[PDB]
Design a protein around this ligand. Structure first.
Ligand SMILES: [Cl-]
Ligand SMILES: [Cl-]
Ligand SMILES: [Cl-]
Ligand SMILES: [Cl-]
Ligand SMILES: [K+]
Ligand SMILES: [Mg+2]
Ligand SMILES: [Mg+2]
Ligand SMILES: [Mg+2]
Ligand SMILES: [Mg+2]
Ligand SMILES: [Mg+2]
Ligand SMILES: [Mg+2]
Ligand SMILES: [Mg+2]
Ligand SMILES: [Mg+2]
Ligand SMILES: [Mg+2]
Ligand SMILES: [Mg+2]
Ligand SMILES: [Mg+2]
Ligand SMILES: [Mg+2]
Ligand SMILES: [Mg+2]
Ligand SMILES: [Mg+2]
Ligand SMILES: [Mg+2]
Ligand SMILES: [Mg+2]
Ligand SMILES: [Mg+2]
Ligand SMILES: [Mg+2]
Ligand code: NA
Ligand code: NA
Ligand code: NA
Ligand code: NA
Ligand code: NA
Ligand code: NA
Ligand code: NA
Ligand code: NA
Ligand code: NA
Ligand code: NA
Ligand code: NA
Lengths: 56, 194, 237, 92
RNA sequence: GCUUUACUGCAGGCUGUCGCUGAGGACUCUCACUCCGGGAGGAGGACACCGAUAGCCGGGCA
RNA sequence: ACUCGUACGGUCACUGAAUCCUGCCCAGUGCAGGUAUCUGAACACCUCGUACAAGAGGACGAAGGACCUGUCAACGGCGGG
RNA sequence: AAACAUCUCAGUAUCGGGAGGAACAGAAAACGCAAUGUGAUGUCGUUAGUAACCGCGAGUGAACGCGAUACAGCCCAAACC
């Protein structure tokens, strides 16, 4: 079975959804964790220094 | 004449001799069965405590913390590393056990601030330290001309920023002359070379 | 290279775990205050999914209902006893001291009260040889002479289900069904049939182990494969 | 080759010819307290030790003469250029 | 990426030593400590575990 | 984790239904056992050195190695004259 | 470093914890232009690419002092009550 187009047909599973805390469609309803703000994993807000250039 | 306190001090100079030696052998048995952080009504080394700032007063807390002995509990590298950085066994943390003890106690009492701490011995694998914490919100402390300084907002979370007793010594701030070039005023300001 | 299969095992992932939730009971000798008075009646005989051997359901006098590691010859209605003064019949459990030497025994405790550790698989049994006030010498199924505290409890008789190993599996499918009831990864790909990256015997233009198969006791995991600290190999001599 | 144990020759100390005695330089024992010794201890740590992880060079097919010429009257010795010699045996 | 008796190191295993650790080149005991027991108590015991260090093995890994 | 498991177990490998069979080799390499003697680190101990210290040397000697033995359905070998 | 292992990139990137409006440091068990001398602490200029480190390779790299800025000095533990 082709890994491309033919394998795209079984994709009717809902995972990432609108997050209660940040509003982004990143709340993974299976994991109950937002990949954008960290809701469900961290009280503190998700954020990293690599999200911007080193000297900025 | 000699203070009664001077006798507690004298005994602790050699914790493996005389009566104290036997107390320890007794005590540790119960300590080893106790938790990581245990609040105690009275300081095991009263002279030590009073000397550090302890007072039989409201808002003053003492707690004994257990910490494992030894070097860094380190995970081996999972990617490329030059030989110099492949190390595991001999690496040791830059923060001493007493300091770890102070932080663990402090986290257990989020509202209190660490005043100071001292050692109360060790066995083959634990090290025990008693930490003196203070309630900066309790009047009685707010009204004490000797401890009120710790109530200032600038002192929130002293231990975590190395403003503690053991914190400052462990940071190399002991000496005011030779040897403290990369230490004072801070390790970070000196590029982290001490 | 990559971690070898024996290393994937230790992580305890689904593939390597036993289907515990599907198991029936943790066969252990009952605890008796003392006196031995404790007796019960066999209410049924069931299949043990964790041992491919039968097991017995027992109702004890004090209301307790527990499955038991069943020796051969136990049936519904029988009355089993557990205690120092228990009669000496198959199916009963008592300390090696109260057991007459020369009697076959099973589900022997390693240390008094641990509930039984030795001789529990299909049709096996231990052999109580010597007594004493200090040591009870038992011969385990492997043939070893084990010195045990005479206070260690045991069950009279040989474990039920003897002869299971006598029948060949005949086909892959039958192994399959059994393997599905154990904490094991099956089937087994030979190391020499793998790539160098996957196993110390992997690689090569043809199939053969790279070095000799006998590996030192001190070899680290990832390398300890083949014949571990073999004192000898082959059949000759 | 052969070489006389004693012979007349210039003594740079006496500043005049005198009988000298020839001897092969016996190696002196190390004290282990030189700077290089302290640097080895100091600088060796986890991983490769740089220069201190190196091992003993090798050998030239023939070594040069390594001798001491000792004045027979003032007792002071001096050193000279050596020359390649597969073997050096003294006469008497 | 892979290999190995390439170079150099790093995990891991084995082993001595020190600390925990106590009483009277082989020995007893019990009090720490470990395990078994619901408890009473039983087994083991200054060893083991753990911390430190030393020697050997060490493409398992860099 | 294996394991609600306990040698009729389960781990680690090789070969690959049945049938007839599976010879010779333990020197090398590997594993394992033994070991008078030899070698074998550090601590403690002894000697020299230093009013101390660095350092040099000795005594003792674990695992390991030398040495001996077992082992090929262990890596493998089975020629020239 | 014309490869590379110590070294270098660098205590940098990145990660964990936490404060404030600024942090941190701070009234000598200091300095050691050795003195009949200086006098808490930051910071700026300089000292100086000096001393020191280093397959003594490539590289790395202070401080005292001085001229400035701003200046500030105190509280416990104990003795005796
Ligand atoms: Cl704090
Ligand atoms: Cl099976
Ligand atoms: Cl010569
Ligand atoms: Cl000055
Ligand atoms: K590098
Ligand atoms: Mg794909
Ligand atoms: Mg600053
Ligand atoms: Mg069970
Ligand atoms: Mg079979
Ligand atoms: Mg069938
Ligand atoms: Mg399965
Ligand atoms: Mg297969
Ligand atoms: Mg293939
Ligand atoms: Mg490999
Ligand atoms: Mg084949
Ligand atoms: Mg083959
Ligand atoms: Mg090194
Ligand atoms: Mg337990
Ligand atoms: Mg490699
Ligand atoms: Mg380069
Ligand atoms: Mg170069
Ligand atoms: Mg640097
Ligand atoms: Mg200076
Ligand atoms: Na706190
Ligand atoms: Na430093
Ligand atoms: Na192979
Ligand atoms: Na150094
Ligand atoms: Na590649
Ligand atoms: Na051979
Ligand atoms: Na052999
Ligand atoms: Na280059
Ligand atoms: Na290159
Ligand atoms: Na260097
Ligand atoms: Na001047």
């Amino acid at each position: 079975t082709g890994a491309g187009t033919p394998s795209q047909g079984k994709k009717n599973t809902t995972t990432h959804t609108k997050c209660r805390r940040c509003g982004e469609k990143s709340y993974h309803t299976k994991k109950k964790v937002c990949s954008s703000c960290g809701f469900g994993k961290s009280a503190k807000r998700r954020d990293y220094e690599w999200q911007s250039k080193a000297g900025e | 004449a000699r203070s009664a306190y001077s006798y507690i001090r004298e005994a602790w100079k050699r914790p493996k001799e005389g009566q104290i030696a036997e107390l320890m052998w007794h005590r540790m048995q119960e300590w080893r069965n106790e938790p990581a952080v245990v609040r105690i009504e009275r300081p095991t080394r009263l002279d030590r405590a009073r000397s550090l700032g302890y007072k039989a007063k409201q808002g003053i807390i003492v707690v004994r913390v257990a910490i494992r002995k030894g070097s860094s509990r380190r995970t081996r590298f999972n990617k490329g590393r030059r030989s110099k950085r492949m190390m595991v066994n001999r690496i040791t943390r830059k923060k001493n056990i007493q300091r770890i003890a102070e932080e663990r106690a402090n986290r257990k009492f989020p509202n209190l601030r660490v005043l100071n701490s001292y050692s109360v011995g060790e066995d083959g694998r634990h090290k025990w330290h008693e930490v003196i914490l203070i309630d900066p919100d309790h009047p009685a402390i707010k009204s004490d001309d000797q401890l009120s300084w710790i109530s200032r907002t600038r002192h929130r979370l002293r231990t975590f920023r190395g403003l503690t007793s053991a914190g400052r010594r462990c940071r190399g701030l002991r000496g005011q002359g030779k040897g403290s070039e990369k230490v004072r005023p801070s390790l970070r300001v000196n590029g982290a070379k001490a | 290279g990559r971690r070898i299969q024996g290393q994937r095992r230790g992580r305890g992932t689904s593939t390597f775990r036993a289907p515990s939730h599907r198991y029936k009971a943790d066969l252990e000798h009952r605890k008796v205050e003392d006196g031995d008075v404790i007796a019960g009646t066999v209410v049924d005989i069931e299949h043990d999914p964790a041992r491919s051997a039968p097991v017995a359901a027992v109702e004890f006098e004090d209301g307790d209902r527990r499955l038991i590691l069943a020796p051969e010859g136990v049936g519904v209605g029988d009355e089993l006893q557990v205690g120092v003064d228990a009669e000496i019949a198959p199916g009963n459990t008592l300390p090696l001291a109260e057991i007459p030497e020369g009697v076959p025994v099973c589900n022997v405790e390693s240390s008094p009260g641990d509930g039984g550790k030795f001789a529990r698989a299909s049709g096996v049994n231990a052999q109580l040889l010597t007594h004493d006030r200090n040591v009870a010498v038992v011969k385990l199924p492997s043939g070893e002479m084990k010195r045990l505290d005479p206070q260690c409890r045991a069950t009279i008789g040989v474990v039920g289900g003897g002869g299971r190993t006598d029948k060949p599996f005949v086909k892959a499918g039958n192994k399959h069904h059994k393997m599905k009831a154990r904490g094991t990864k099956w089937p087994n790909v030979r190391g020499v049939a793998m790539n160098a990256v996957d196993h110390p015997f992997g690689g090569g233009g043809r199939q053969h182990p790279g070095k000799p198969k006998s590996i030192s006791r001190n070899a680290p995991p990832g390398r300890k494969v083949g014949d571990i600290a073999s004192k000898r190999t082959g059949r000759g001599g | 080759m052969q070489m006389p144990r004693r012979f007349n020759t210039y003594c740079p100390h006496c500043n005049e010819h005198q009988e000298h005695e020839v001897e092969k330089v016996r190696s002196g024992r190390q004290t282990g307290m030189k700077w290089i010794d302290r640097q080895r201890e100091r600088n060796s740590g986890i991983g490769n030790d740089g220069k201190f992880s190196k091992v003993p060079g090798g050998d030239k097919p023939t070594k040069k003469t390594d001798l001491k010429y000792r004045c027979g009257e003032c007792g002071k010795a001096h050193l000279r250029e050596g020359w390649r010699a597969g073997r050096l045996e003294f006469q008497e």
